[PDB]
Every structure is written in structure tokens, then in C-alpha cells.
Symmetry: C4
Subunit: 400 residues, 4 copies
């Protein structure tokens, strides 16, 4: 979109002015050579203040917002330079630099999504500090005694001084020699201390948030381990729990499915649940013929559970009541004595369907081959769901 | 209220003393010219210590509170200056400056609401640092060898030194030349390091809290996106969820209605719910004649839900049971084959009323035109509510 | 307890050694004058390593813990000073200073309750930095060329240099002149940068936690206000909600009773609930004769609710079901037309008792005079409680 | 595993290059003496870029990942040194140093578990800063005027300058004398300010997280104490609650069992619950003969509760319904008048079994000897469990 290109162009124009205005205040002879750009740049500025009125909600000129735009659109710089009027009034040429805050707001709004906000604020602060350093170096030159030194070396020395002061390094090889330079130095010292404190605070804020997920996982694991140590839990079970948390981190950054899915609204939660359990519940022979309404109601009630390697999901002879769907990993179905393996079931398969229709003991043992992500449906909830689908209840009773 | 103006006046008086007392300790000749203000200022102080006793709960003189007020109300400064007594005892003139902490407490209490507390602490620290810098410059002058330099240049040099030290820039063009100046320099170096660390910590605390809502939204979105990536969700559904979160941010800063309304007490929650659902439930033909008690009970149980563009709220033939109220956005009511559009419903309208009275299949499909903020009422909860209003139950049964 | 006094004495002894050992390494002549204290101090140290074995669980000598104690109990300093052996081996005299970490652990454990842990860590760091500054000044003197300067001025200059370096101020009036002094300066510069970064981090951590309750209240209020602004809530209701939050802050720091009471175990929660509702439920005529078991069961189920000024708690003719207990504030009981006031009820009184026994409409309107802290008991929960006390149910039915 | 040893070897090789390359750029004569190591080191690098392809998922050469590895595997350094080609093109020899970020990633991945991530980032930053300081000192030497000074003293002076600048101490005894040195100084000043801000931010982040559990406990206790102070709770009950929180901290760091056990999945939660309640529920005479299924169902529903010293768990004559299992601490069973002690029960014992079968009043009072960790089973939940085990219900009814 060309409007963003216009905003980038105005970024360039305001940077042009932030560079040129103090550098022209210290070197008046620089005015006329760059005059054809100045009229070009100022025109662009007068082009902007009516433009964004068509985008602010895609005319509150009396509000504090849009005040720096119009205040910085006045051709004060041209008049000040042309009139060669005295410096104490010439300083009003800087009023155009108030466009900087509006340009910062625009850049923040057009980079508010691709860039971390803390990093965006840090980068904006760094750019502002570089521009302020340029301005402060120009002021330092303006207070320096006249000399035959080339303008480039003068600017280099002033920028060296201002960087030495703002960074608080303070070599002191360049120091104020006059009372006005001393007052200016005091002001710049306070400003540099504030700017460097802002830099440090922004960096601290940025870096304190980097490992949020990993630090949350670590605090969770330490809490659990300390509590289990208090309860005198044996180290084997503690090792199994530690490796469970290792699995949870390496697979899904320690996030709980139960808590993540609550952050979605019901239509999106239903879409996600239908996506994850794709055809796994619509391939079950118990309710192949069921309507999609019953399928949706079943899908919304599946509870995620993770079983570790070798953990028993079902033991033969237990008065079980739950059916399980394998979302990831694999399980072995074993005899009641576990001396022989009836089957291996893998991702996309299911077991325990008999518990939903009958109330009989479990036919065979089920044991996880490794870390299995499974979904559990309780017969209590299955009956609750059947309570509102009499046709499906009749179908399943006929099957039973 | 004039009491706040009195507190501002005492702010001015304590700033007057914090400036004058060390500057008089270094320039005794400054005493008499400002004497008519001093008696004016000290009187104001003796006017204060009985005054706030009428406001402290709107007389605990033995408590640590109100101790700095009375301790700083003693006319020690006048006696010390008048007696021209020796400097080691003259330093007791500074006891009046203990009013500063009480004035800071007062300013914090009268600006505790309009101003962010972290920013308020930062500003108080900055003011304290400026006053301390003035005092330290006065001490530096007090340890300097006598000279014919004008008092203004002496103060400027001392303030330059103390600012250079406190900001930790340390040019070193002004350095202690005597052992007493060296001890003073060491003390001031430690104090300046502590003050600048306090400044940096306050700035870091302030800036780490700026984007709390945006950072919470970002961490939520990253958690959800990472989890959906683990579940191998298709990118179309991920895009729909991302645009849902974009809508949630751009409309309501990512806040959950369900969680915001829990932070209000029941009377205020009821007032808010009655305000939002204004006449939308009192215009429904199903219960036009119902009493306001039933209306309130219904209003408290409406559940907010957001549907994205093109999402199906109701599909024809479904065994639906919920009525929906459109709080924002618009929906289209479509035929069972969706090849024709029966109607468009907008903000303030409702659909699905038949499900509450009957138990019949849905007559027509309902699909969101865009992001719709809707309120859902389940027939289970509607029946729960009807259980306590037999007259309304009879009315609705007669309608059915 | 005298054991804490012993630990304070050993604090004094370890500070004595941390001062003396480097100062004796630079001034050997200081050894013999303080020898009678040294044997006194070292004896105290050899007295400690068997003592705390009786307190460590109120003998794991092979563990890393208690290793610095025994390692710092060896009389190495006495031998090094007496042998006047060469400096590269004389540096082993510093091994006694390893008592510092054990003394820091002891001080942290005996001040872990009266003092904020972050402030405790900051103070420990500051003390360690002062001791390290003393040691570094001694090293700087040890690398300085011999001179006739008095020892006091030499120490003052070295301490000035080390404070100037550690605080990163860096005047540079004292600088290394030799390669060994340059290497030492580099090491001390890195150490000072690390120490000052530690100071800044500790201060930032301390100050970022100061206003936790106030910042939580502010973020809550901003969230609620922003959400209500999105919902287009009228400014009058917003003002009422703002003043409700103001009341909540000024009374109880914004804490929710419902959430605070969940942080207590059941016996303590019951004790607190019995304390708050003291005789208010045991004075009700409905169940004066009830046993204390029923009283406890009733007391555990009272729900706190806050009503704002002028809010209607009960309106005449409503099909109400709740009884209310006034814990603070006062309410007015008014006629059905509100044109006359039947009564005013205050702290410790109750209203709405008829709703529990009968099912009749409310006899009169109840309206809050100001912010009232009330407790609500629902007839549904009252019936649940009566279900387990048949005698009390019979009593209340006889009353009805 | 030898692969980790290979990664450590490549750590050594990349450190070798990061040291040698700039030091050879400033001292070309250093090239040939270390040439037999260079060919040895570069070979190792060309050995790596095919190796990790077998481990990246235990070949995406077009991705940004693995780009620095191949870019840093080119023998550019050998050619640049052998060709003695001009310095502006010789600077390309540094391209090999891009191996540093890959080595940092590898070290982070192989130390991501034993080391706190914040501390790991801080240590990596410190190492990077030391290497950068070496490089910057080499650049400073490269811009220095030729002199007869020994290379060691030149390097020492350059390293002194760069450490003085990066730490922001800034003595200023060594300062740029030429415009190119001034530009280099400005760049290094900005880089050092950024690096020191990074150090401070990392330290602040690290130290702000140290006392997370203790600070959470303190904020909990302050919240509870403030709320109880508002409710005008008597100081005796407040003292009992404070000592309860002291017990909770000293035993289990203030963690709630109810919340810790929710962070485990159902199989691990069941394993932990079976471990804690080991034989305590399988020794009860009420259900000695019960199957392990009923035992598991009972075990999952035990609620933890802590009773303070002297607190009454059961009072004689109460219409109680709960059985209690002593996990830690001890209780006394006392007569109805409490004038005699029937028994003392300790860890691993139980009381209140009669309430589960009968509905009779409590036979005797039970009072905690000290802080008791107990588990409560309610008859309501016991009946819920019995509802699914008819055989056990028949057994317990026969016992009753
Ligand atoms: C990012 C935004 C940064 C803004 C800072 C820009 C400062 C530019 C100052 C140039 C002053 C100059 O260039 O000189 C001004 C006159 C001498 O002017 P002259 O050389 O014509 O005589 O000196 C003086 O007022 C001394 C310096 C006074 C600076 C006041 C700046 C106020 C900014 C707002
Ligand atoms: C609320 C406001 C309160 C204002 C209180 C003002 C008190 C001082 C007024 C006089 C003044 O302004 O005193 C200026 C002083 C020098 O005073 P003098 O020439 O009378 O000394 C005697 C010279 N003899 C010995 C050669 C004769 O010099 C100076 O600039 C001293 C510094 C002036 C204030 C700087 C504040 C910096 C902020 C932090
Ligand atoms: C914000 C609050 C700031 C407070 C700091 C105020 C410090 C004022 C010191 C003035 C000392 C002075 O002006 O001179 C004191 C005498 C020479 O006094 P003299 O010139 O009459 O001889 O020097 C000395 O004690 C050397 C300096 C000693 C400063 C002690 C300050 C204690 C503050 C509490
Ligand atoms: C809080 C804990 C603080 C501990 C720091 C204590 C440092 C004391 C150093 C005294 C060195 C000294 O006093 O001089 C040591 C010799 C010259 O010894 P000399 O004057 O007898 O010849 O110089 C040298 O090694 C140069 C300095 C070497 C310092 C190594 C300190 C190692 C600490 C662990
Ligand atoms: C993994 C470990 C890797 C070690 C790699 C070592 C590479 C350098 C070895 C040689 C050395 O050690 O080079 C010492 C250099 C001076 O070498 P040169 O006398 O041969 O120069 C030529 C002198 N000409 C022109 C008068 C003839 O001077 C120096 O101390 C240079 C600095 C030595 C290393 C400092 C590291 C600081 C840490 C950050
Ligand atoms: C951790 C990673 C650290 C990396 C920093 C390494 C910087 C090494 C610079 C050595 C420059 C040198 O040693 O000299 C380069 C020439 C003179 O080279 P010459 O003495 O042969 O004449 O001076 C110059 O370009 C002035 C210095 C320019 C440095 C550019 C470094 C770019 C790094 C990326
Ligand atoms: N031969 C088999 N092959 C595969 N799965 C089986 C086999 N026998 C039993 N199962 C599954 O093992 C489950 C154990 O619990 P159920 O008896 O409830 O339901 C059983 C089936 O889902
Ligand atoms: N012609 C129509 N115009 C507007 N709304 C309709 C029309 N026909 C059906 N509806 C609404 O569409 C809803 C679909 O669900 P119901 O059958 O429960 O209730 C239906 C009405 O609320
Ligand atoms: N004359 C009165 N004086 C005090 N309280 C009253 C009076 N009349 C009614 N009430 C109280 O007002 C309440 C309004 O609700 P109820 O009818 O449930 O119960 C009523 C009593 O608790
Ligand atoms: N003599 C006793 N010795 C040990 N425990 C007892 C004794 N008498 C009663 N109890 C226990 O005290 C409990 C008090 O509550 P119950 O009557 O429910 O169950 C009682 C038994 O568990």
C-alpha cells in the first residue's frame, strides 16, 4: 500500500530535517546549497497534515493529538535561515522537529505487529538518542570559541564529546572552559544520565522477558520436585515425573492443553477439536451411523491425558468405564497375565469401546509403549450426551 | 480546597529552605537580606504542626510519624545564623530539612491518583537528587580553599563537579586536592553511585510495566499458536484464530468479558449487565409480559461469545437449544441449502427463540456476516430460571 | 538467646579479620601490636566449627557445606605473619576470609524474617563491596612504589582510587603507571563493573516490587474501565464502579475476601469466619436454639458482598430468597413506595429472615445508606444445610 | 558421549581463532609459527559442517540456520595471511568468527538443563564481551602510530583502554589523538555502553528471580494479614495464622498440595497418591478385603488438610461424617469432657472410621498435638465411590 511508502518518505524527510536544522544553525552557509531540498521537504510536510485525516479512523484539529503535526508544518526554518535573524530567536527553527514524535507514533503503529514492542521501544529510543547526540554536538560547536579548524574536525570533536558524555564514560579530555559551556555541560550530563538510564531500563525489560516459557516450566518443575521431596517420594517416581516434564517441554513447551483450549471461543475451540480428532471418532463402529451433532458433542468432551512409557492405561479385570483415543504414541494390548501381547495400537486408533455400552470387566490389559497423548471419554459423560440423543441411545442399546 | 493550596505553599517553603540553608552556610552574608522571608517561612512551619492533626483521620505526637515535622519546626537555623557559631555546630541548621520527607509524603498522597505511582516515585527521586546536588555543591565549596572568585562561578564549578560525580561521568577535570576533600569525594562518589542506581532501577521498573496488556496478549497468542503447531493444525484455521485474536485486541485489548465481569460485585455486575442488554431481552415476544425479577435473572445468565466472519452459529435441522442476542455485528439467516438468504439481523436483534419453548429442529441456518459479539442463553439454564417463576412458565407453556 | 549473640560476636571477629589481614599484608609492623586480639579472635573461630553441629538440625564434615568454616579456622594468618615468608605465599593468609560466606549465611538466616529478602541481599552486597574495596585498596598499595608518605595518606589515596573505579566514575587522576598496576587495574575494572551491575540489579529488583498491591489494583481498574468503555457503559455507572474500587482500595487494599479466605486451611478459615460473624448468627431468632454444629455449617457458607451508596439490596414485592447480615455500614428499610422509612439497621444487625422460612414476597424495600459490607445466605444453601439437621428443620417448620 | 567432546573441541578451536585472527592481523609475523595449528584447526572446521546433519533431528543447507557454519568454514584466513594482501581486504579474515554464534547455540543446548538459562545467557554474554574486548584492543593497536614498544606492552595498553571504555569507567589517560582513532573511539564507546547495559539487564533479570518462592509466600502472608487486620481479627488468631504460614514455609516452601498435584497427569498423580498413602488405606479394617480398584478410587479422593497445635479435629457428640488419616504429626483422642486422654495416634494411623458406616455422634474428641498433616475423606464422597462397587457396599453394610 502506497500510504505506508508515504509514511516512510516522511520518515526520511523528518530525519533530513533533524540532521540539517542544527547543522545549519551552526553552519549558515549550508542553507542555500540544500535549499531546493528544503522547499521539497517542507512541501511534503504541508502535504501530510490534511492527508491522515482520511485515515485516523479507517478532523479533531483542536485536540492535543495532531497538534505537533501542524506546529511542525509551519515554514519557520525557511524564514529563520533567510532572515539570518539572531540566534536566540533563530532557535525557533527547531520547532519543525516536533514531527519526530508523530513519526515515532506512525512507525510504532506500522511495526506494532512484526516486532516485539519492547524491542521497538528500545530501537526508537536508540534512534532518538542518536539524533539528540547530533543536536547536542551542534550546540557544543555553537558554544565553542571561533577557530580555523575545518568544519568536519569540529563536528567530529563535538560528537566525540557528546558521545563521551551521554555514555557516561567521561574521559574528560574535552571539557567546558567557560561558564556557559559549564552550564551546557551540566544540562547535557543530566540528559545523558537520563538517556543511559532509559537505555539500561529498556534493555533490562527486554531481557527479563526472553525465557518466559522456560522459566515458567522451571519454576513448575522445582515446585513439584520440592513438594515431592517433602512427601518423601521415592527417587524412581521422581525420575519418572522429571522425564514426564522433559517430554512436556520438548513437545509443547510445557503448555497445558486444558488451559490453552480455554483461551479460544466456543466456535474456534470446536473447530480445533474437530481438526485434532479428525475421523478418529467418526470411524468408531459404536456410533458410525451417528449424526454430526452427536459427533460434535462427543468431540467437545474428550479429555487429554499423557501416559508415560510402560504405564498401565487399562488392567484386565478392572471395572473400567472409559474409552481411549490415541492421538500420539502407541500402546500394547496384553493378556491378563501380560505374558503375551494381543496387539499394538498406534496413532489414530482407539480402545476401550466395550466399557461405554456394557458394564463388564476389562477384557485385556493396555500398557503404553512410550509417551502417549491420549483422549479419555468417561461413560458418565457419554451417558450425559446420550441423554439428549434418544435415537443414538436406541442404536447403542440395540448394539448392546 | 484551600488545604491543598496550603500544602503547596509548604512545598514552596521547604524548597526555599533546602536551597537557602546550605547556601547561607557557605555564604553567611546571604542571611540578613533574606531574613524577612525566613521569619515568614518559619512561621508557616510552626503553623503546620498543629494543623494536620485535624486531617490525619478525616495527635499521636509520641509516634515516629509527625516527629520529622516537629523536629523540623524548631527555629535552629535562625539561632545558628544569628550566633555565627562555629561550623561543626552550625551544621545543625540543616535539621529543618527533615520537613522534606513529610512534604514528599503529602505530595505522594495528593498525587497518588492522577499519577502512576512508579512515575511519582521517579519524579520524587529526581527532585531529591537535585536538592542533594545543591547541598553537595555547597559542601564542596565549604571545603574549597579561599579565593577571590565570584560566588556565582564558585557555585557553578561546585555544581559542575557534583553533577559530574553523581551521574558517574567523571571527567576528572575537578578533583579533590586535600585529604578532607578526598574523604568528601569518596562519600559523594558512593552516594552518587547509589542515587544513579536508584534512578536506573526506577526507570527500569517504570518501563517494564508499560506494555502489560500488549505483552499479555502476545504471550497468549504465542502460547496458542505454538500449541496448535504441535497439534499439526492446518494453517487456514490458524489464520482464522490469529485474526480472531487481532479482533479481540483491536476491540477490547484482549480482555475476557467472563473474567472482567467477575471483578465486579453482584450489584454492579447486575447494573452493567442491565446496561449492556438494554431492552434487548425486554423486547422479546416470548416473555414481553414477564416481571423485572425474571428479566434480571435472565440477564445475569447470558454468556458472551464471539463468532468470526462466515462462522455458522446455527445450521438448519440441528437439534438446537439456544437463543442468541446480537450485541454487535450482524448475521444472515439462510435457507437449509444456503442458496437463498431469508434475512439479515443486526445489533440489538435476536434469533433462536423457538428452541427455548419447543424442542424442534432449527428452522433455518444462521451464519455470521463478520465478527459478531453475541450472547447465548441455554435452554437448560432457561428451564432452571423458569423453575422459580411458575407464572412465566405457565405463560410460555400457553404460548407453546 | 545467647547463641545469636555468639553469631554476632563471630560477625565482629570476621569483620576484624577482613579489615586486618590485607592491612597487615601491606603493613607488617601492624602484626605484633594486634597479636593479643588475633589469638583471641582465632580461638573464637576454632570454638565455632564444633558448635554449630549441635544446631544444624535443631556432622556432615565431608560435605561442601561447613568446608569454608573449617578451611577458615586454620591458623594460616599467624604462621604467614610470623614467618614473614614471601608475599606470593603470604597471600594464603587470606584463606581465613572464607568465613565471610558462612557468616553471611548465618546473618541471612537470623534476619530472614524481620527484613525483606531483597533488601537483605542488597545490604549484604553493599557490605561485601565495602570489604572488597578495602582489600583492593590494600592490593593497590602493595603494587605502589615505595615512598615516605604516611600510611594514612597512602591508604586514603588507594581507597579513593578503588572507590573511583568500582563506582565507574573514573576521574583518572590516579592511574596505573606500570604493567603490573595496569593488569591489576584491568582486573579491578572488570570486578567493579560486575559489582556495580549487581548493585543496580538488586536495586531494580527491590524497587520493582514496592507497589505490588497498588499496581495490581490499578491494572484491575484500568482493565475494567477499558472493557466498560468498549461496551459503551454510561459514565454514571462507570463513576459508581470507580468509587467502588476506591472504597475497596481504601478499606482493604483491593483484596477479594473470597480469594483471601481460600488461602487458609479449613480449621483456620472456620476460626476466622466464627470470629468475624461473632454472635450475629447466634442472635437470630430463627435459629436461637440451634446447636453449634449447625451454626458452624451456616457460618462457613456466608458469602461476602459489598453494596454501594443508595443501591437497592431488597425491593418490596420481589420474590426474594436471601437473608443478609450487616458486617459494616448501614441500610434503611423503606416502604414499598419508598416515601417513608420504616427503620435503619446498622453493623451487627440482619434482615431478610422471612425469605428463609416462607416463600412470600419481600415485605419492604432495603437500600444501602453507604458502602455496606454484607453477608448473603441463599435459601438453596440454607435448605442444603437443613437437609443434615432434621431437628433444626422441624424447629424452623414449626416456626413457619 | 564423544559427540559432546567433539563440540567442546570445536569450542576450543573457535576460541583459538577468535584470539589469533585479530592478533595476527596486528602482528603478521605470528602467522607462520602457528600455521601447523591453523591447518589443524581449519580441518576440524571443515570436518564439522557435514557432521551435525546426522544430529539435527536425532540437510537444510539453503536455510539461514547452518549458514554461519559453512560461511565460517571457508579457508579465507589462510589466503588473507598468505597473500599479505591489503588490510581493507584483509579484514575478511574475520569471517571465520561467525562460528561463534553456532558454538554459542551448541553450548546453550548442551548446558540448557544443568544451568539456569538466565545465568547461561549472562555467562555467554561475558565470554562474548571478553572476546570482543580482545578484538577491539587489536583494532586500537591497528590504528596506533608505529613505535618501538614491545608487542606485549602495546597489547596491554590497548586492552587497558578497551576495558576502561567498555566498563564506562573512562579514566581518559589513553585517548584518541587522530580523527580515525576518534571515530573508532566513538564506535567503541557506543558498543561498550550497549554491552554494559546488556550486562546490567542480564544481572537484573537474574537477581529479580532468585527469591520467587519466598517473595510469593511473603506477598501471600501480607495479603492475608492486611485483610484480617481490616476484619478486626483478634491478635491471638492472627498469631496462630502467622505460625501456620511459618510451618507451611519451613516444611514445603508454602506450596499448596491441592495445586501441586493438579500439575501432574492422572497416571502420575495416581502413582504419587498411592506412594504417599502407602498401606494406610489398605490397613483399615473397614475395607481390608476391598479390591485394588476401590483402593485407587478412594486414594484419588483424599483431601489434604493441616491442623495447628491444639486445634480440635473432632469433638465428642458432633454429628460428624469424615474419616481422617494421619500423614504427619500426632493427635490425642480425649474423653467427651477432655479430662482424660484415651489414646495418642501418630503418623500412619487413622481415626473417624465409624462416621463412614454409621451416622452416629462422634464417640470421642480428637485434638492435634502439633501441626498435623492429615487426609480427610467425606462420607458423601465415600458413598459416591461405593455407588460403583456394589460388593464393597454390601460388605460395609454387613459390617454395619
Ligand atoms: C532528537 C531531537 C533533538 C533535539 C536537540 C537539538 C538541539 C540543537 C541546538 C542547536 C543550537 C545551535 O546550533 O546554536 C544555538 C546557539 C548558537 O547559535 P549560533 O551559532 O547561530 O550563534 O547556542 C545555544 O543557544 C546553545 C545551545 C542551546 C540548545 C537549545 C536546544 C533546545 C531544543 C529543544
Ligand atoms: C523556592 C525557592 C527558593 C529560592 C531561595 C533562594 C536563596 C538564595 C538567594 C540568593 C541567591 O540566588 O544566591 C546566589 C548565590 C550567591 O549568593 P551571594 O552572591 O549573595 O553570596 C554572597 C557573596 N559574597 C560572599 C561575595 C558577598 O549563588 C548561586 O547562584 C547559588 C545557587 C543558586 C540556586 C541554585 C539551585 C540549583 C538547583 C538544584
Ligand atoms: C535533599 C537534602 C540534602 C541535604 C544535603 C545538605 C548538605 C549541606 C552541607 C553544607 C555544608 C556547608 O556549607 O559547610 C559545612 C562545613 C563548612 O562550613 P563553613 O563554610 O561555615 O566553614 O563543611 C563541612 O562540614 C563539609 C560538608 C559536610 C556536609 C554534611 C551534611 C550532612 C547532612 C545531613
Ligand atoms: C571481601 C573479601 C575481599 C577480599 C580481597 C582481599 C585482597 C587483599 C590483597 C592484599 C594484597 C597485599 O597486601 O599485597 C599482596 C602483594 C604484595 O605483598 P607485599 O606488599 O607483602 O609485597 O601484591 C599482590 O599480590 C597484588 C594484589 C593481589 C591480590 C590477590 C587477592 C586474592 C584474593 C582472593
Ligand atoms: C583457545 C586458546 C587459544 C590461544 C591462541 C593464541 C594465539 C596467539 C599466540 C601468541 C601470543 O600469545 O601472542 C602474544 C602477543 C604478541 O605476539 P608476538 O610477540 O608473537 O607478536 C609479534 C611481535 N613482533 C612483531 C615484535 C615480532 O601479545 C599478547 O599478549 C596478545 C594477547 C594474548 C591473548 C590475550 C587474551 C585476552 C582475553 C580476552
Ligand atoms: C567476539 C567477536 C569480536 C570481533 C571483533 C574483532 C575485531 C578485529 C579487528 C582487527 C583489525 C586489525 O587488526 O586491523 C585492521 C585495520 C588495520 O590493519 P593492519 O594493522 O594490517 O594495517 O584497522 C582497521 O580497519 C580498524 C579496525 C576495524 C575493525 C573492524 C572489525 C569488524 C568486525 C566485524
Ligand atoms: N485382540 C485385540 N486386538 C486389539 N484390541 C483388543 C483386542 N482384544 C481386546 N482389545 C482392546 O483392549 C481393550 C481393553 O479394555 P476393553 O475390554 O474395555 O476393550 C478392549 C479392546 O478395546
Ligand atoms: N424469515 C425469517 N426472518 C428472520 N428470522 C428468521 C426467519 N426464519 C427463521 N428465523 C430465525 O432463524 C432461527 C433459526 O433457529 P430457530 O428455528 O430456533 O429460530 C429461527 C428464527 O430466530
Ligand atoms: N418494621 C421493620 N423494622 C425493621 N426491619 C423490618 C421491618 N419491616 C420489615 N423489616 C425487614 O425488611 C426485610 C425485607 O425483606 P423481608 O420481607 O424478607 O424481611 C424484612 C425484615 O427483615
Ligand atoms: N479407645 C480409643 N483408642 C483409640 N481411638 C479411639 C478410641 N476411642 C475412640 N477412638 C477414635 O476416636 C474417633 C472419634 O470419632 P469416631 O466416633 O467417629 O471414631 C473414633 C475412633 O476413630
Amino acid at each position: 500500500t502506497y500510504t505506508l511508502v508515504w509514511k516512510v518518505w516522511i520518515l526520511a524527510v523528518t530525519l533530513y530535517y533533524a540532521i540539517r536544522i542544527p547543522l545549519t544553525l551552526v553552519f549558515p552557509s549550508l542553507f542555500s546549497p540544500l535549499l531546493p531540498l528544503d522547499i521539497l521537504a517542507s512541501l511534503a510536510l504541508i502535504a501530510d497534515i490534511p492527508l491522515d485525516l482520511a485515515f485516523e479512523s479507517r478532523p479533531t484539529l483542536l485536540a492535543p493529538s495532531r497538534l505537533p503535526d501542524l506546529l511542525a508544518a509551519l515554514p519557520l526554518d525557511l524564514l529563520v535561515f533567510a532572515l539570518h535573524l539572531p540566534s536566540p530567536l533563530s532557535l525557533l527553527s527547531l520547532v519543525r522537529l516536533l514531527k519526530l514524535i508523530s513519526v515515532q507514533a506512525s512507525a510504532t503503529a506500522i511495526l506494532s505487529y512484526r516486532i516485539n514492542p519492547a524491542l521497538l521501544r528500545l530501537l526508537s529510543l536508540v534512534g532518538f538518542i542518536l539524533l539528540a547526540a547530533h543536536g547536542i554536538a551542534c550546540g557544543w560547536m555553537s558554544l565553542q570559541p571561533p577557530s580555523e579548524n575545518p568544519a568536519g574536525t569540529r563536528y567530529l570533536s563535538a560528537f566525540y564529546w557528546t558521545i563521551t558524555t551521554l555514555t557516561t564514560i567521561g574521559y574528560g579530555d574535552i571539557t567546558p572552559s567557560t561558564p556557559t559551556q559549564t552550564v551546557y555541560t551540566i544540562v547535557i550530563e543530566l540528559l545523558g544520565a537520563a538517556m543511559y538510564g532509559l537505555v539500561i531500563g529498556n534493555i533490562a525489560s527486554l531481557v527479563s522477558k526472553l525465557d518466559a516459557a522456560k522459566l515458567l516450566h522451571r519454576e513448575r518443575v522445582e515446585r513439584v520436585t520440592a513438594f515431592l521431596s517433602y512427601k518423601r517420594i521415592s527417587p524412581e517416581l521422581q525420575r519418572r515425573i522429571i522425564e514426564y516434564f522433559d517430554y512436556l517441554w520438548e513437545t509443547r513447551r510445557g503448555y497445558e492443553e486444558r488451559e490453552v483450549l480455554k483461551e479460544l471461543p466456543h466456535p474456534l475451540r470446536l473447530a480445533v477439536a474437530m481438526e485434532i480428532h479428525g475421523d478418529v471418532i467418526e470411524k468408531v463402529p459404536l456410533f458410525k451411523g451417528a449424526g454430526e451433532e452427536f459427533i460434535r458433542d462427543i468431540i467437545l468432551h474428550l479429555e487429554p491425558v499423557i501416559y508415560g512409557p510402560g504405564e498401565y492405561i487399562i488392567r484386565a479385570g478392572e471395572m473400567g468405564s472409559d474409552v481411549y483415543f490415541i492421538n500420539r504414541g502407541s500402546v500394547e494390548v496384553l493378556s491378563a497375565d501380560e505374558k503375551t501381547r494381543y496387539a499394538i495400537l498406534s496413532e489414530g486408533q482407539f480402545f476401550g469401546e466395550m466399557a461405554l455400552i456394557l458394564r463388564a470387566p476389562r477384557t485385556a490389559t493396555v500398557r503404553a509403549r512410550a509417551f502417549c497423548d491420549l483422549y479419555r471419554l468417561d461413560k458418565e459423560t457419554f451417558d450425559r450426551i446420550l441423554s439428549r440423543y434418544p435415537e443414538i441411545a436406541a442404536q447403542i442399546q440395540e448394539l448392546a
